[PDB]
Amino acid sequence: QIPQCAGCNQHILDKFILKVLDRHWHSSCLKCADCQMQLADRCFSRAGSVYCKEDFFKRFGTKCTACQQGITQVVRKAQDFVYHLHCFACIICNRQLATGDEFYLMEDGRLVCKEDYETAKGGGTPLVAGSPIGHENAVQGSAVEVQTYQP
Ligand SMILES: [Cl-]
Ligand SMILES: [Cl-]
Ligand SMILES: [Cl-]
Ligand SMILES: [Zn+2]
Ligand SMILES: [Zn+2]
Ligand SMILES: [Zn+2]
Ligand SMILES: [Zn+2]
Numbered sequence: 001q002i003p004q005c006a007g008c009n010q011h012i013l014d015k016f017i018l019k020v021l022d023r024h025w026h027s028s029c030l031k032c033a034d035c036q037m038q039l040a041d042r043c044f045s046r047a048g049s050v051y052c053k054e055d056f057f058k059r060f061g062t063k064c065t066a067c068q069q070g071i072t073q074v075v076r077k078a079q080d081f082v083y084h085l086h087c088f089a090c091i092i093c094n095r096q097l098a099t100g101d102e103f104y105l106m107e108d109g110r111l112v113c114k115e116d117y118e119t120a121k122g123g124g125t126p127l128v129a130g131s132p133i134g135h136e137n138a139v140q141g142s143a144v145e146v147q148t149y150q151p
């Protein structure tokens with residue numbers, strides 16, 4: 001089926017069809033709201049608009065998953081979730097997780113150290129704590145893929 005552009009809602013007759021996480025785009029509609037630059041690498045969307053990596057970081061403040069508050073300091077990451085270092089902590093024992101620590105990530109971003117998770121015997125994802133990283137590397141935009149309507 002010929003997709004309608006997520007941006008302009010028109011049918012995309014371009015041979016190349018850009019796909020951003022389950023949505024389809026004209027190449028010419030995937031442009032940063034700020035600097036009007038084509039988005040070929042990846043896409044940063046907030047609210048109802050799209051931005052490049054640079055213009056996005058300078059516009060929106062990344063909010064910690066646990067405390068829901070802004071963070072120019074290094075952060076911790078588990079999957080897509082982003083945390084203050086002091087919020088990267090087990091919800092049961094309140095102990096801060098450190099690089100190398102084994103923990104479980106719950107669906108809503110709640111963190112549980114390995115020992116407390118396994119002691120209590122819902123569904124958690126096993127992970128190993130990575131070292132702190134910068135915001136830039138923290139929030140990786142959505143991948144822009146390319147599809148073509150073929151026979
Ligand atoms: Cl398609
Ligand atoms: Cl074409
Ligand atoms: Cl550490
Ligand atoms: Zn379009
Ligand atoms: Zn831009
Ligand atoms: Zn926090
Ligand atoms: Zn714990």
